[PDB]
Amino acid sequence: MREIVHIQAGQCGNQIGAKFWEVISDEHGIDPTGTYHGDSDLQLDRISVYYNEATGGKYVPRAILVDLEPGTMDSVRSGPFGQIFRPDNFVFGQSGAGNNWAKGHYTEGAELVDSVLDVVRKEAESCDCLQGFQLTHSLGGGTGSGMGTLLISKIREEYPDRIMNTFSVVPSPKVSDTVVEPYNATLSVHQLVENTDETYCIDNEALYDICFRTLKLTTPTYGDLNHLVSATMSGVTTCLRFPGQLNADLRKLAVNMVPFPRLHFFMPGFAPLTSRGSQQYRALTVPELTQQVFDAKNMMAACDPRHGRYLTVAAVFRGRMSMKEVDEQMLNVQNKNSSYFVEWIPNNVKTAVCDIPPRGLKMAVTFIGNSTAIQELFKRISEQFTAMFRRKAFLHWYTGEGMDEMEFTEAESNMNDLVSEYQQYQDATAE
């Protein structure tokens, strides 16, 4: 029985975590009251991985929500599923970090970081054997950007033998017009490289473009992006909550998908693409899903998987497809002589097959690969980070709190070295 502690910080982080928990609860068959009412025995053989069995046969979540601002806290407390989260697992202040990374990591977010450690430690004491912590936040802001880094740096010192996985949400100028976002993203990535084993990047520009073109929505709001983020999160954590032949734990998955220490950013995806409201319209097959998992349109990041090498590939199928039918399809797409052969679907790919399908869909698929194209996500922020650094714009706010140009240049050098290593590995011999 391997348990996982889920933590949420920042407005966007909490909004994503609430939706993800609601999705994985509706898929497992858990009414919003707390009891169980599903119709499948497979929805309980691994429920202990994210739910504590309290008295009375109830399943208490393990989501530790923290937020300096008392906004999203009250909304999640009175949500469709707000009554599930323990009430002393909510840790908040009054004034946030004011879009400054040096506020939610040094002067403000380090004022509740001690209450966070007490809560995450009180939650882990009941577990029989902890596997690894988890965090869901956005690189944009101060309580998501600085608080997450502070907690990741503080927990690694007391639990070095635990896996550290995050779900960073890179912002984009299209979604937010804030100008102090490049610095918060750079400083967050600087800490998310030396104290993180895995990081699932969910760029906001990709979801914005998807909602603008694919879904054809009028004004894509935050709900449309949160729905896709929660869908991708539920599709990624399919092996850690359901049985199957590929019993890849968290540590095993991180070791098999992350050969290098610094390189650990993935490009998660999910298909088919849907929206809120209606969903039932067309039933997809295994060939169509495989053809669409590997399309740059189904990806949640502004990167072209085809343009770049393939470090490690993995896919998770959900529905009445059999690992034998999947192997037949995964052994004819890595062959040129084979018809309908693809050049971007690589070899030695990891593949899974689930029984319980997602909500509102009979068949789906999730992609969790790591391509060098992700470098584009790091360069877009580099340029915006240099043009504003030469003029020293909005730097007094950082220098007054305690930060200095030393950390800025260190983060810049780290990002440059990472981009250089990515570009160097992109040109490697296949055999």
Partner: protein, 438 residues
């Protein structure tokens, strides 16, 4: 007499020990609950099965085994198995975290909070034995736990139980039946850490046994269960020298003098014949000569190699069942007239032959039939070095890009251990060829 304790480690190790104990109980007639109606004593000291089993005042037979695992998934099924009343609960030790295919874990991360208890349990069994010979380790190089924890226990025992023999029965990993992509690193690390902690060690190629089960036994997809039943036969044929009142390799120390001439070289090849299926039980009757000649077949060998292109240092033949020296002389003469094999002039040991008046045994409704005779040939040849060559290829290629290396250094390991382990492997490979110089 002298007793012995078998220390099983890993998933493969615990899966192989259960089948071995089942075969021993079926041979000696021990009931599942542990009752020998043929034994005419309550305690051990005059019989012959006391070397492996232990007697008590209540007539209960507690096998001398120390099963230790990290993942309780297999131990839970082993406890509630058919022989739940055979093994003692204290002998079965379970952990709380799996190494997840890692050596720096099974050694430093998950091997530190379990070693302090394994010794206390092994001492309880060591104090009861009046004269222990050594230890019978059962693990695999592929499994991270079975390698790291086993090496840690081995060296931990080298300090305390220093004047005791040491044996091993590893399982060489194969590319087909591969559970981890770091299999080459764990194997080259455990072979270097315990190259001095093993007096003798037995290697089982997963490819050879799979091919044997697919061809000889005629099976479509030989599962781990079928591969463990086939290895149980060889394990029993090897342990019969110490279990029964024989006259060849009766003590663990004799193995280091009649099979392991060089302390460093301790990887003797083993073969067992015949391999008849259950359907073709009374189809053909192969005499001693046929089974003795079949031992020189690469397909029937337990490891994929080519002994023809290599010299021989030590050779030991063991016959079981209806066998007479007059018939063994025919096979001995055929080995020289028909076949021909060279020998190392600098080796002290030579050829040895022994017979035991104990017929074989098979599990009811199993894969193998109740043959009338059996032969086991243990030959220490340099050809086995080839099996170590390919293993070094994969490891070398992987460490060329240092992939999955950061996961080990960040778990109580140094970057120099890999260089030391491959410097040791290179020296061993060089010595293997130097021993076979014309």
């Amino acid at each position: 007499m002298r007793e012995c304790i078998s220390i099983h480690v890993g998933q493969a190790g615990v899966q192989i020990g259960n089948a071995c104990w089942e075969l021993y109980c079926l041979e000696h007639g021990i009931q599942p609950d542990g009752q020998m109606p043929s034994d005419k004593t309550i305690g051990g000291g005059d019989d012959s099965f006391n070397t492996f089993f232990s007697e008590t005042g209540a007539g209960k037979h507690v096998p001398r085994a120390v099963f230790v695992d990290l993942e309780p998934t297999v131990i839970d099924e082993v406890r509630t198995g058919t022989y739940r009343q055979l093994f003692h609960p204290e002998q079965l030790i379970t952990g709380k975290e799996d190494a997840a295919n890692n050596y720096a874990r099974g050694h430093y991360t998950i091997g530190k909070e379990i070693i302090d208890l394994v010794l206390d349990r092994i001492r309880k069994l060591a104090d009861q034995c009046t004269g222990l010979q050594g230890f019978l380790v059962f693990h695999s190089f592929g499994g991270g736990t079975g390698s790291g924890f086993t090496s840690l226990l081995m060296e931990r025992l080298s300090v305390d139980y220093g004047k005791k023999s040491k044996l091993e029965f590893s399982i060489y990993p194969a590319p087909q039946v591969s559970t981890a992509v770091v299999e080459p690193y764990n194997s080259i690390l455990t072979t270097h850490t315990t190259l001095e902690h093993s007096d003798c060690a037995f290697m089982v190629d997963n490819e050879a046994i799979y091919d044997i089960c697919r061809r000889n036994l005629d099976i479509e997809r030989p599962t781990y269960t079928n591969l463990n039943r086939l290895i149980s036969q060889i394990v029993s044929s090897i342990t019969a020298s110490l279990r029964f009142d024989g006259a060849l390799n009766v003590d663990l120390t004799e193995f280091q003098t009649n099979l392991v001439p060089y302390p460093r070289i301790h990887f003797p090849l083993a073969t067992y014949a015949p391999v008849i299926s259950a359907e073709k039980a009374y189809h053909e009757q192969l005499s001693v000569a046929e089974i003795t000649n079949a031992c020189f077949e690469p397909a029937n060998q337990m490891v994929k190699c080519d002994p023809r292109h290599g010299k021989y240092m030590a050779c030991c033949l063991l016959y079981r069942g209806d066998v007479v020296p007059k018939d063994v002389n025919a096979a001995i003469a055929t080995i020289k007239t028909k076949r021909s094999i060279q020998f190392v002039d600098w080796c002290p040991t030579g050829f040895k032959v022994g017979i035991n008046y104990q017929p074989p045994t098979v599990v009811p409704g199993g894969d193998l039939a109740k043959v009338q005779r059996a032969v086991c040939m243990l030959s220490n040849t340099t050809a086995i070095a080839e099996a170590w060559a390919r293993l070094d290829h994969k490891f070398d290629l992987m460490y060329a890009k240092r992939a999955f290396v950061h996961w080990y250094v960040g778990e109580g390991m140094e970057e120099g251990e890999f260089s030391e382990a491959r410097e040791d492997m290179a020296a061993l490979e060089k010595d293997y060829e130097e021993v076979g110089v014309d």
